[PDB]
Design an enzyme around this catalytic site. Structure first.
Site, PDB file in Angstrom:
ATOM      1  N   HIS A  14       3.140  11.314   6.527  1.00 40.93           N
ATOM      2  CA  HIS A  14       2.463  11.056   7.790  1.00 40.93           C
ATOM      3  C   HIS A  14       3.458  10.470   8.756  1.00 40.93           C
ATOM      4  CE1 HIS A  14      -1.649  10.718   5.636  1.00 40.93           C
ATOM      5  NE2 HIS A  14      -1.222  11.950   5.838  1.00 40.93           N
ATOM      6  N   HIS A  29       1.947   9.248   1.033  1.00 39.12           N
ATOM      7  CA  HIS A  29       0.944   9.029  -0.015  1.00 39.12           C
ATOM      8  C   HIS A  29       1.319   9.913  -1.208  1.00 39.12           C
ATOM      9  CE1 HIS A  29      -1.652   7.163   2.962  1.00 39.12           C
ATOM     10  NE2 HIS A  29      -1.018   8.000   3.764  1.00 39.12           N
ATOM     11  N   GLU A  89      -3.480  13.668   0.576  1.00 40.18           N
ATOM     12  CA  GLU A  89      -4.800  13.268   1.142  1.00 40.18           C
ATOM     13  C   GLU A  89      -5.530  14.472   1.717  1.00 40.18           C
ATOM     14  OE1 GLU A  89      -3.890   9.862   3.760  1.00 40.18           O
ATOM     15  OE2 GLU A  89      -4.425   8.708   1.960  1.00 40.18           O
ATOM     16  N   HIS A 104       5.342   7.263   6.712  1.00 39.14           N
ATOM     17  CA  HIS A 104       5.065   6.836   5.368  1.00 39.14           C
ATOM     18  C   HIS A 104       4.495   7.993   4.606  1.00 39.14           C
ATOM     19  CE1 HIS A 104       1.164   6.429   7.424  1.00 39.14           C
ATOM     20  NE2 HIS A 104       0.691   6.831   6.230  1.00 39.14           N
ATOM     21  N   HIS A 125       0.837  -1.204   0.000  1.00 44.53           N
ATOM     22  CA  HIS A 125       0.000   0.000   0.000  1.00 44.53           C
ATOM     23  C   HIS A 125       0.868   1.248   0.000  1.00 44.53           C
ATOM     24  CE1 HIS A 125      -2.476  -3.134   2.117  1.00 44.53           C
ATOM     25  NE2 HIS A 125      -3.210  -2.826   1.064  1.00 44.53           N
ATOM     26  N   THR A 182      -6.039   6.981   7.757  1.00 47.57           N
ATOM     27  CA  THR A 182      -6.588   7.155   6.406  1.00 47.57           C
ATOM     28  C   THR A 182      -6.495   5.894   5.542  1.00 47.57           C
ATOM     29  OG1 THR A 182      -4.626   7.982   5.304  1.00 47.57           O
ATOM     30  CG2 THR A 182      -5.976   9.603   6.422  1.00 47.57           C
ATOM     31  N   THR A 183      -6.070   4.788   6.181  1.00 48.79           N
ATOM     32  CA  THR A 183      -6.115   3.473   5.572  1.00 48.79           C
ATOM     33  C   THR A 183      -6.903   2.583   6.531  1.00 48.79           C
ATOM     34  OG1 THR A 183      -3.993   2.720   6.512  1.00 48.79           O
ATOM     35  CG2 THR A 183      -3.886   3.723   4.334  1.00 48.79           C
TER      36      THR A 183
HETATM   37 ZN   LIG Z   1      -0.927   7.892   5.779  1.00 45.60          ZN
END
Ligand SMILES: [Zn+2]
EC number: 4.2.1.1
Length: 257
Positions: free
Chosen positions: A116, A93, A103, A91, A61, A195-196
Protein backbone atom coordinates in the site's frame (compact mmCIF):
# COMPACT_ATOMS: atom_id res chain seq x y z
CA UNK A 1 -5.54 -2.19 21.65
CA UNK A 2 -6.36 -3.54 18.19
CA UNK A 3 -4.31 -6.08 16.30
CA UNK A 4 -4.48 -9.32 14.37
CA UNK A 5 -4.68 -12.04 17.05
CA UNK A 6 -7.77 -14.06 18.11
CA UNK A 7 -8.59 -11.64 20.83
CA UNK A 8 -8.09 -8.26 19.17
CA UNK A 9 -8.22 -9.10 15.45
CA UNK A 10 -10.39 -7.72 12.61
CA UNK A 11 -13.71 -9.20 13.90
CA UNK A 12 -13.33 -7.11 17.10
CA UNK A 13 -12.44 -3.83 15.57
CA UNK A 14 -16.00 -2.63 15.19
CA UNK A 15 -16.39 -2.32 18.95
CA UNK A 16 -13.95 0.65 19.23
CA UNK A 17 -14.35 1.70 15.53
CA UNK A 18 -17.99 1.42 14.50
CA UNK A 19 -17.17 2.56 10.93
CA UNK A 20 -15.72 -0.98 10.56
CA UNK A 21 -19.28 -1.94 9.52
CA UNK A 22 -19.66 1.14 7.26
CA UNK A 23 -20.81 1.56 3.69
CA UNK A 24 -17.38 1.89 2.01
CA UNK A 25 -14.99 -0.41 3.85
CA UNK A 26 -11.82 -1.96 2.48
CA UNK A 27 -10.45 -4.26 1.33
CA UNK A 28 -12.95 -6.05 -1.03
CA UNK A 29 -12.90 -8.99 -3.29
CA UNK A 30 -12.41 -7.77 -6.92
CA UNK A 31 -14.69 -9.97 -9.06
CA UNK A 32 -12.99 -9.49 -12.45
CA UNK A 33 -16.20 -10.43 -14.29
CA UNK A 34 -18.28 -7.74 -12.57
CA UNK A 35 -15.67 -4.97 -12.93
CA UNK A 36 -16.34 -2.88 -16.00
CA UNK A 37 -13.83 -1.09 -18.29
CA UNK A 38 -14.25 2.64 -17.91
CA UNK A 39 -13.26 4.72 -20.95
CA UNK A 40 -13.66 7.93 -18.90
CA UNK A 41 -10.48 7.03 -16.93
CA UNK A 42 -7.47 9.22 -17.77
CA UNK A 43 -4.07 7.58 -17.97
CA UNK A 44 -2.54 7.00 -14.46
CA UNK A 45 0.65 9.02 -13.72
CA UNK A 46 3.01 7.70 -11.05
CA UNK A 47 5.64 10.51 -10.68
CA UNK A 48 8.18 9.17 -8.12
CA UNK A 49 11.51 10.55 -9.47
CA UNK A 50 11.94 13.24 -6.75
CA UNK A 51 10.87 10.90 -3.85
CA UNK A 52 12.62 11.54 -0.55
CA UNK A 53 12.34 8.57 1.84
CA UNK A 54 13.30 9.42 5.43
CA UNK A 55 12.85 6.57 7.87
CA UNK A 56 11.38 3.13 8.38
CA UNK A 57 9.31 2.41 11.52
CA UNK A 58 7.91 -0.80 13.14
CA UNK A 59 4.53 0.34 14.58
CA UNK A 60 3.53 -3.00 16.09
CA UNK A 61 1.14 -3.68 13.20
CA UNK A 62 3.31 -3.37 10.09
CA UNK A 63 6.40 -1.27 9.05
CA UNK A 64 6.11 2.06 7.37
CA UNK A 65 8.62 3.61 5.00
CA UNK A 66 8.00 7.35 5.56
CA UNK A 67 8.54 10.11 2.94
CA UNK A 68 9.08 13.85 3.04
CA UNK A 69 5.66 15.19 1.93
CA UNK A 70 6.43 18.87 2.60
CA UNK A 71 6.45 19.48 -1.21
CA UNK A 72 5.18 17.81 -4.44
CA UNK A 73 8.08 15.30 -4.75
CA UNK A 74 6.49 11.93 -5.25
CA UNK A 75 2.91 12.22 -6.60
CA UNK A 76 0.08 10.17 -8.08
CA UNK A 77 -2.24 11.79 -10.65
CA UNK A 78 -4.56 10.79 -13.43
CA UNK A 79 -6.68 7.63 -13.55
CA UNK A 80 -9.78 8.25 -11.44
CA UNK A 81 -8.08 11.08 -9.49
CA UNK A 82 -8.93 14.75 -9.59
CA UNK A 83 -5.79 16.75 -8.85
CA UNK A 84 -2.53 15.73 -7.19
CA UNK A 85 -2.00 13.22 -4.38
CA UNK A 86 1.32 13.21 -2.51
CA UNK A 87 3.05 10.08 -1.24
CA UNK A 88 3.37 10.00 2.53
CA UNK A 89 4.31 6.37 3.35
CA UNK A 90 4.17 2.82 2.23
CA UNK A 91 3.74 -0.46 4.03
CA UNK A 92 2.80 -4.05 3.45
CA UNK A 93 0.41 -6.73 4.68
CA UNK A 94 1.51 -10.39 4.57
CA UNK A 95 0.84 -13.91 5.58
CA UNK A 96 2.31 -16.65 7.71
CA UNK A 97 2.24 -18.92 4.62
CA UNK A 98 2.48 -17.98 0.90
CA UNK A 99 -1.17 -18.92 0.28
CA UNK A 100 -2.48 -15.88 2.19
CA UNK A 101 -1.49 -12.37 3.13
CA UNK A 102 -3.17 -9.97 0.70
CA UNK A 103 -6.12 -7.82 1.77
CA UNK A 104 -7.78 -7.38 -1.64
CA UNK A 105 -8.44 -10.63 -3.42
CA UNK A 106 -8.95 -11.24 -7.12
CA UNK A 107 -11.84 -13.68 -7.84
CA UNK A 108 -11.32 -14.77 -4.20
CA UNK A 109 -7.53 -15.45 -4.83
CA UNK A 110 -5.31 -14.36 -1.95
CA UNK A 111 -1.75 -13.26 -2.81
CA UNK A 112 1.25 -13.73 -0.40
CA UNK A 113 1.28 -10.03 0.42
CA UNK A 114 0.10 -6.60 -0.58
CA UNK A 115 1.86 -3.23 -0.76
CA UNK A 116 0.00 0.00 0.00
CA UNK A 117 1.51 3.32 -1.13
CA UNK A 118 -0.51 5.97 0.75
CA UNK A 119 -1.08 9.40 -0.74
CA UNK A 120 -3.08 12.47 0.31
CA UNK A 121 -4.94 15.04 -1.82
CA UNK A 122 -2.92 18.26 -1.87
CA UNK A 123 -6.14 20.35 -2.08
CA UNK A 124 -6.59 19.61 1.66
CA UNK A 125 -3.19 20.91 2.75
CA UNK A 126 -2.03 17.96 4.84
CA UNK A 127 -2.80 14.36 5.73
CA UNK A 128 -4.79 15.17 8.89
CA UNK A 129 -7.31 17.39 7.10
CA UNK A 130 -7.34 15.00 4.04
CA UNK A 131 -8.80 12.26 6.29
CA UNK A 132 -11.82 14.39 6.99
CA UNK A 133 -12.75 14.20 3.30
CA UNK A 134 -14.41 11.57 1.11
CA UNK A 135 -11.68 12.11 -1.54
CA UNK A 136 -8.86 12.81 0.86
CA UNK A 137 -6.59 9.83 0.07
CA UNK A 138 -5.43 7.56 -2.77
CA UNK A 139 -3.85 4.21 -2.02
CA UNK A 140 -1.94 2.36 -4.72
CA UNK A 141 -2.25 -1.30 -4.01
CA UNK A 142 0.19 -3.83 -5.50
CA UNK A 143 0.03 -7.62 -5.00
CA UNK A 144 3.10 -9.74 -4.19
CA UNK A 145 3.56 -13.33 -5.23
CA UNK A 146 6.42 -15.65 -4.35
CA UNK A 147 8.75 -16.44 -7.24
CA UNK A 148 11.85 -14.56 -8.38
CA UNK A 149 13.45 -12.03 -6.00
CA UNK A 150 12.54 -8.38 -6.39
CA UNK A 151 15.81 -6.55 -6.33
CA UNK A 152 14.20 -3.16 -5.62
CA UNK A 153 12.86 -4.66 -2.39
CA UNK A 154 16.11 -5.97 -0.95
CA UNK A 155 17.11 -2.67 0.79
CA UNK A 156 13.86 -2.95 2.74
CA UNK A 157 14.43 -6.60 3.64
CA UNK A 158 17.96 -5.85 4.82
CA UNK A 159 16.94 -3.09 7.27
CA UNK A 160 14.23 -5.21 9.00
CA UNK A 161 16.79 -6.75 11.45
CA UNK A 162 17.21 -3.23 12.91
CA UNK A 163 13.48 -2.58 13.54
CA UNK A 164 12.48 -5.99 14.80
CA UNK A 165 10.13 -4.83 17.56
CA UNK A 166 7.29 -2.36 18.04
CA UNK A 167 8.51 1.27 18.41
CA UNK A 168 11.88 0.71 16.65
CA UNK A 169 12.82 3.00 13.72
CA UNK A 170 15.91 3.39 11.45
CA UNK A 171 17.14 5.93 9.00
CA UNK A 172 15.92 5.01 5.51
CA UNK A 173 17.01 7.66 3.04
CA UNK A 174 17.44 7.43 -0.75
CA UNK A 175 15.09 4.51 -1.21
CA UNK A 176 13.44 4.45 -4.67
CA UNK A 177 9.81 3.33 -4.58
CA UNK A 178 9.90 2.95 -8.37
CA UNK A 179 11.67 -0.36 -7.72
CA UNK A 180 8.45 -1.78 -6.24
CA UNK A 181 6.20 -1.27 -9.30
CA UNK A 182 5.26 -3.94 -11.82
CA UNK A 183 5.71 -3.31 -15.55
CA UNK A 184 2.03 -2.57 -16.26
CA UNK A 185 -0.16 0.08 -14.56
CA UNK A 186 -3.48 -1.65 -15.56
CA UNK A 187 -5.66 -1.32 -12.46
CA UNK A 188 -9.03 -1.60 -10.80
CA UNK A 189 -10.42 1.36 -8.88
CA UNK A 190 -13.22 1.80 -6.34
CA UNK A 191 -14.06 4.11 -3.35
CA UNK A 192 -13.06 2.58 0.00
CA UNK A 193 -11.30 3.05 3.32
CA UNK A 194 -8.08 2.66 5.24
CA UNK A 195 -7.75 -1.01 6.16
CA UNK A 196 -6.47 -0.45 9.69
CA UNK A 197 -8.10 1.54 12.50
CA UNK A 198 -9.33 4.21 12.28
CA UNK A 199 -10.74 2.68 9.11
CA UNK A 200 -11.59 6.07 7.67
CA UNK A 201 -13.69 6.24 4.49
CA UNK A 202 -11.44 8.52 2.44
CA UNK A 203 -9.67 6.43 0.00
CA UNK A 204 -9.78 6.13 -3.80
CA UNK A 205 -8.25 2.70 -4.21
CA UNK A 206 -6.15 1.94 -7.23
CA UNK A 207 -5.18 -1.80 -7.22
CA UNK A 208 -2.75 -2.88 -9.94
CA UNK A 209 -3.65 -6.06 -11.84
CA UNK A 210 -0.08 -7.26 -12.31
CA UNK A 211 1.59 -8.57 -9.17
CA UNK A 212 5.27 -8.22 -8.42
CA UNK A 213 7.29 -11.30 -7.67
CA UNK A 214 9.37 -11.49 -4.53
CA UNK A 215 11.47 -14.41 -3.33
CA UNK A 216 10.62 -16.88 -0.63
CA UNK A 217 13.68 -15.61 1.23
CA UNK A 218 12.45 -12.01 1.03
CA UNK A 219 9.00 -12.76 2.41
CA UNK A 220 10.50 -15.06 5.08
CA UNK A 221 12.38 -11.97 6.44
CA UNK A 222 9.13 -10.01 6.74
CA UNK A 223 7.82 -12.91 8.86
CA UNK A 224 10.72 -12.53 11.39
CA UNK A 225 9.47 -9.13 12.49
CA UNK A 226 7.54 -8.82 15.84
CA UNK A 227 4.27 -7.28 16.80
CA UNK A 228 5.53 -7.09 20.44
CA UNK A 229 7.94 -4.42 21.83
CA UNK A 230 11.54 -5.16 22.94
CA UNK A 231 11.60 -7.21 26.15
CA UNK A 232 8.15 -8.74 25.64
CA UNK A 233 7.26 -12.24 24.62
CA UNK A 234 7.79 -12.80 20.87
CA UNK A 235 4.67 -12.71 18.68
CA UNK A 236 5.78 -12.94 15.10
CA UNK A 237 4.43 -10.19 12.75
CA UNK A 238 2.47 -12.41 10.34
CA UNK A 239 -1.07 -12.40 9.01
CA UNK A 240 -1.44 -8.63 9.48
CA UNK A 241 -4.21 -8.52 6.87
CA UNK A 242 -7.86 -7.55 7.05
CA UNK A 243 -10.20 -9.83 5.07
CA UNK A 244 -12.56 -8.72 2.35
CA UNK A 245 -15.49 -6.55 3.43
CA UNK A 246 -18.95 -6.18 1.84
CA UNK A 247 -18.98 -4.31 -1.43
CA UNK A 248 -22.39 -2.77 -0.63
CA UNK A 249 -23.47 -0.10 -3.09
CA UNK A 250 -20.16 0.17 -4.97
CA UNK A 251 -18.82 -0.51 -8.45
CA UNK A 252 -15.29 -1.54 -9.30
CA UNK A 253 -14.01 -0.07 -12.59
CA UNK A 254 -11.17 -1.39 -14.75
CA UNK A 255 -8.67 0.75 -16.56
CA UNK A 256 -8.15 -1.91 -19.25
CA UNK A 257 -10.34 -3.82 -21.74
ZN1 LIG B 1 -2.31 -1.17 4.34
Amino acid sequence: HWGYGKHNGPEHWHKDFPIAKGERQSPVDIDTHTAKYDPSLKPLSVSYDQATSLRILNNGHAFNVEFDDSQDKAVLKGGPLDGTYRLIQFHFHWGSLDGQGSEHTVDKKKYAAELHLVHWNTKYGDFGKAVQQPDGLAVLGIFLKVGSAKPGLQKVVDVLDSIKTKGKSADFTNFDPRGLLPESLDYWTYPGSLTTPPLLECVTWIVLKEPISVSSEQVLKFRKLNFNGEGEPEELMVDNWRPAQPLKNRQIKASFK
